[PDB]
Paper text:
We determined the crystal structure of CidAwMel to 2.75 Å resolution. CidAwMel is made up largely of α-helices. Residues 111-154 and 158-165 are disordered and cannot be modeled, which divide CidAwMel into an N-terminal domain (NTD, residues 1 to 161) (see below for why we include these disordered residues as part of the N-terminal domain) and a C-terminal domain (CTD, residues 162 to 422). Interestingly, the region of CidAwMel which is disordered in the absence of CidBwMel (residue 111-154 and 158-165) is modeled to form a helix bundle upon complex formation, consistent with its role in mediating CidAwMel-CidBwMelND1-ND2 interaction. These residues are part of the N-terminal domain.
Author numbering: 5 to 83, 87 to 110, 155 to 157, 166 to 276, 280 to 422
The structure:
Amino acid sequence: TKRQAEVLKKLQDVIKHTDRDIAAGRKLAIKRWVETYIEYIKLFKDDKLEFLYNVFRDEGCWLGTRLNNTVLGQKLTEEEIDNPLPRYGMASRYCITGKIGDFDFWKKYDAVEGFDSTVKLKWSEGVEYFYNQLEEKDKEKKLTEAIVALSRPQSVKRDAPILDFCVRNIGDKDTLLQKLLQKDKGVYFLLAELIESCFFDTVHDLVQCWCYKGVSACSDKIFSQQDYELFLYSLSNVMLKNPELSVQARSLIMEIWKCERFAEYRETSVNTSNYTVPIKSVLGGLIINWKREDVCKPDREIEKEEILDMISFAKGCFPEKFDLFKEVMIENLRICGREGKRKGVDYGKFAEELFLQLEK
């Protein structure tokens, strides 16, 4: 495990891109990659790890924050330094049927069967190949089916990369929303799974089409109060877990929270009752992220403003309950014990300070 962990860090410290977010996205992609192929690389040494460097420092392999599997597979089949990885193991894993490594699943399969089987196997490189071999008519239907199947409660992290791929290849996200709404909380599970794996871009696209595109939405709210509140709580946890992607997580928090379609939900989230308020984790999450000192963070002022405006919004909706709101938040920040929180510092004081500024 220590060895496995070392492997992960070394492979991530080579990625460098001008945009911090793109890089961080890639460090995550590498993590996911290493998760899939850990056994192959388990026993390894630095010298053998340089082959993984020339293919990972090559921007050809990278398509945005994600990896171009086709290119990557080709690079994983060339025996400069030796491929310590087996060509056959990799070729099969990357569905390179032709140019089979030669000297498991991989026979010959029709497209639909392969698609339906690869998804069951949670084989991200498998679903992609078959998607290509699919008839154009059948494409959207097959993808939609996969999404519905994989947007399920008892899910796993592997499902998210496939879900990401399916959403990005859906050419009509309006019908997708509709086929998802038939499933119980099928829309929540799709967004929550993409959030946990930090596929923020995909979520933004979905939020823009499903919440911001039109005056119309048969329930006007695609999400419920619970799903709305859970989205924000889950986003605040990921933001504290991935401080380099906090800008993208903060923008998603604001877009969901301040959406006009969910304005009633926004007012309910700041209603303090029974010594609790649903925005506690989220408002506490932004405060902790704003006071982080282990990262060089530009625009801490913008972050402070969001916090202040969220506090001001709570005062404007229920002015009578504001002192209750202040006491609940201060007490929550003193016992929270969440990630990114510096131990031994009283975060309650920071809140008290924000409350005073508001008074003036």
